[PDB]
């Protein structure tokens, strides 16, 4: 008897070794571990009358190959070991599957339940097996019951889903290859040096967004306004109140403050109310990335990778989802009972106490009807490495928080009417009455104020106060989380790809990490400006989202993949035309960028001068400065030197402006 000898079997293709193992244990109490080409795979002789072999793909086994040089109109699937030397290790997975496929009765794609898994399984079965004998397992968690359920409900492959993923891969590859070679070729022909440059259908509009926002930030000048704070003596309290009215000119604010001193104020309304602070909804992937970035500093790409690992451990549901809902087809009770039998037992006892034993998900807005929100399966976490445990604990507490109870806050608002004036201002304080979910998803601080006890009709006096200057503020620099939110909001990429695009931008050195903020490098800056200057259509956020909408329509059967491919060729042909025209200037710009041809540098940076010895950005900085100073003068009456000092001292002031300002203060 040969343990690993089998015939007349269905071949089940899984994406990862852990998923293959999980599927084997779902199908048999004694699955057989085999090894060939140094790859572990599983034989199921036990399940019903049929036999099964479960093999991991390890990831993509196929990649796109096209023409060399520029332009590239074609993209065809080839084994990755043949076309990508960083992927020759996959050859052994390719060999195993090809060997097991010849003697197979049929094929089951059990890759992950997203578009990538549909493509991976399709390419493998189509090329190594028989596509006409192909079925799809669609599961959202690697629990025995979810796997068995999907095995029982095996369906045809979803060719519309497959075509949507193929279309996105081919269109992404075609745009990246063509634009990146067009850039490198224009430099080779103009400076005779070859440097590696990259571009992407989503990377490039993303880099342009960041560069444009960094320019705007670097040209920002805080403008002044004035606020009035008053001190109200009423009963035993001394209340510092910031008045809700703002003033452009300092004289209007002084006027306003002085007519309030020594006036009487009367409590004319008291409002005591209990406010709800709703328990959170279960994570979709973006929400998880956002929260794990804020709390632990884990990058979006790593959050997704870690969540995928936890799903492969059977600990959470599949994390590539937009949904913030848990439908009734998911047993909350089973999850809760699982967590009760784990290190989360005491947290579950607390949720039981908070709810009385009634566990109701606070359903979020976003849906994804085939892909529920991220939640724990109820299987017990054990021995989790550090970053894994942080992510699992986030997901578990978010879920447990979502089935607990809304928090309650007591609010008291006093309305105070000034004597002789049509003006009334408020004093308010909030206290936590019931913490509830705040003790479960304990990552949300609630500001509490010391109580203030006043009755309707109580009177006091405004005894003192101050006019205070308030400087306008720049839009914040991007964080990874903040950039990721912009991508989601603009519908660039998918929630599965956005985190990787951000990481690819850093790896290829167009972006860099300055603390929590992600800023351009010089190279990223130049590439963004070049793409902006010469190829605005390919970095237009609206047109990128347009393409995203067409890709989404392939999934529904509403548009043909072949039609999106044709339309993309049309777009490439338009890029080709624009490239022939501008190629020499594109190459010249790239040359200046890397110091390859000497330029007359700006007085304050390395960019090429534009006017007055200033680059285009420092020149705009000066224009903005002159106008901002005028606004400062009209509003504050400060003299020139003092306005400059106040702009120079504010960290809101862009660096281009700050260069100009420091110069003018150094002048004589
Ligand atoms: Zn400059």
Swiss-Prot record:
Concerning CDD domains, the annotation shows:
TOP1Ac, TOPRIM_TopoIA_TopoIII
| Residues the record marks as active site | 318
What is catalysed by this protein? ATP-independent breakage of single-stranded DNA, followed by passage and rejoining
Alphabetical list of InterPro entries matching this protein: Topo_IA, Topo_IA_2, Topo_IA_AS, Topo_IA_cen, Topo_IA_cen_sub1, Topo_IA_cen_sub2, Topo_IA_cen_sub3, Topo_IA_core_domain
Names of the cofactor(s): Mg(2+)
Keywords from the named record: Disulfide bond, DNA-binding, Isomerase, Metal-binding, Topoisomerase, Zinc
SS bonds (residue pairs)? 4-34
Activity under varying temperature: Optimum temperature is 75 degrees Celsius for topoisomerase activity. Optimum temperature for decatenase is 75-90 degrees Celsius.
Any GO molecular function: metal ion binding
Q: Which SMART domains match?
A: TOP1Ac (SM00437), TOP1Bc (SM00436), TOPRIM (SM00493)
EC number from the UniProt entry: 5.6.2.1
Q: How is its activity regulated?
A: Single-strand (ss)DNA regions and DNA single-stranded binding protein stimulate relaxation.
Sorted alphabetically, which NCBIfam families does this protein's record hold?
PRK05776.1 (NF004438), topA_arch (TIGR01057)
Assembly and oligomerization = Interacts with helicase Lhr-Core.
Function of this protein? Relaxes negatively supercoiled (SC) DNA in an ATP-independent manner at 75 degrees Celsius. From 50-85 degrees Celsius relaxes negatively SC DNA; at up to 100 degrees Celsius it unlinks catenated DNA to form circular double-stranded (ds)DNA molecules. The promotion or prevention of DNA linking/unlinking is temperature-dependent in vitro and probably depends on other factors in vivo. One study found single-stranded binding protein (SSB) does not enhance its activity, while another study found it does. Binds single-stranded (ss)DNA and less well to Holliday junction (HJ) or forked DNA.
Stated family: Belongs to the type IA topoisomerase family.
Listed name of the protein:
DNA topoisomerase 3
Q: Tell me which species this is from.
A: Saccharolobus solfataricus (strain ATCC 35092 / DSM 1617 / JCM 11322 / P2) (Sulfolobus solfataricus)
């Amino acid at each position: 008897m040969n343990l690993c000898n089998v015939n007349n079997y269905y071949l089940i293709i899984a994406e990862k070794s852990k998923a293959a193992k999980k599927i084997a244990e779902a199908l048999s109490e004694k699955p057989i571990l085999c090894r060939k080409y140094n790859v572990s795979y599983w034989i199921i002789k036990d399940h019903n009358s049929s036999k099964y072999v479960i093999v991991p793909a390890a990831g993509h086994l196929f990649g796109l190959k096209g023409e060399s040089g520029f332009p590239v109109y074609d993209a065809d699937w080839k084994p990755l070991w043949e076309i990508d030397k960083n992927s020759y290790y996959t050859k052994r997975y390719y060999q195993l599957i090809s060997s097991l496929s010849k003697y197979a009765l049929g094929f089951i794609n059990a890759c992950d339940y997203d578009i990538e898994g549909s493509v991976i399984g399709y390419l493998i079965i189509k090329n190594l097996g028989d596509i006409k004998k192909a079925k799809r397992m669609k599961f959202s968690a690697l629990t025995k019951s979810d796997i068995l359920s999907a095995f029982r409900n095996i369906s045809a492959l979803d060719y519309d889903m497959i075509n949507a993923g193929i279309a996105r891969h081919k269109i992404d590859w075609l745009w990246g290859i063509n634009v990146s070679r067009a850039l490198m070729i224009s430099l080779q022909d103009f400076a005779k040096k070859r440097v590696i440059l990259s571009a992407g259908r989503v990377q490039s509009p993303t880099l342009v967004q960041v560069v444009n926002s960094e320019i705007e930030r670097n040209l920002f000048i805080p403008l002044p306004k004035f606020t009035v704070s008053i001190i109200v003596k009423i009963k035993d309290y001394s209340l510092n109140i910031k008045v809700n009215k703002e003033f452009e000119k300092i004289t209007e604010a002084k006027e306003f403050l002085n007519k309030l001193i020594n006036k009487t104020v009367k409590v004319v309304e008291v409002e005591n109310r209990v406010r709800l602070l709703e328990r959170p909804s279960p994570f979709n992937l973006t929400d998880l990335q956002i929260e794990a970035g804020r709390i632990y500093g884990i990058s979006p790409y790593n959050v997704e990778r870690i969540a995928e690992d936890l799903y492969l451990d059977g600990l959470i549901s599949f994390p590539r989802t937009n949904s913030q809902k848990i439908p009734s087809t998911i047993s909350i009770y089973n999850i809760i009972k699982g967590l009760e039998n784990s290190s989360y037992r005491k947290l579950v006892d607390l949720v039981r106490k908070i709810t009385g034993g009634k566990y109701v998900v606070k359903q979020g807005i976003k849906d994804d009807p085939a892909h529920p929100a991220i939640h724990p399966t109820g299987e017990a976490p054990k021995n989790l490495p550090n970053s894994k445990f942080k992510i699992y604990d986030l997901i578990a507490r978010r879920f447990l928080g979502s089935v607990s109870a809304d928090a309650k806050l007591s609010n008291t608002i006093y309305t105070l009417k000034v004597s002789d004036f049509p003006l009334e201002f408020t004093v308010s304080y909030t206290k936590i009455l019931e913490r509830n979910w705040l003790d479960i998803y304990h990552f949300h601080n609630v500001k509490e104020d010391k109580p203030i006890f006043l009755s309707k009709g109580d009177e006091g006096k405004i005894v003192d106060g101050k006019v205070n200057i308030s400087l306008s503020k720049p839009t914040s620099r991007y964080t990874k989380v903040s950039l990721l939110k912009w991508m989601e909001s603009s519908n660039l990429g998918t929630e599965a790809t956005r985190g990787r695009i951000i990481e690819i931008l850093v790896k290829r050195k167009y972006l860099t990490n300055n603390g929590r903020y992600i800023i351009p490098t010089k190279l990223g800056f130049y590439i963004a400006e070049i793409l902006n200057k010469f190829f605005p259509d390919i970095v237009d956020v609206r047109m990128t989202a347009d393409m995203e909408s067409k890709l989404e329509m392939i999934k529904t059967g509403k548009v043909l993949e072949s039609k999106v491919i044709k339309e993309n060729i049309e777009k490439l042909n338009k890029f080709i035309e624009e490239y022939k025209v501008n190629k020499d200037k594109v190459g010249e710009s790239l040359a200046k960028a890397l110091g390859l041809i000497k330029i007359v540098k700006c007085k304050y940076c390395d960019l090429e001068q534009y006017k007055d010895g200033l680059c285009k950005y420092h020149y705009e900085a000066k224009v903005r400065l002159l106008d901002a100073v005028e606004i400062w003068k009209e509003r504050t009456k400060y003299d020139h030197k003092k306005i400059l000092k106040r702009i120079s001292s504010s960290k809101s002031t862009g660096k281009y402006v700050k260069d100009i300002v420091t110069y003018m203060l150094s002048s004589e």
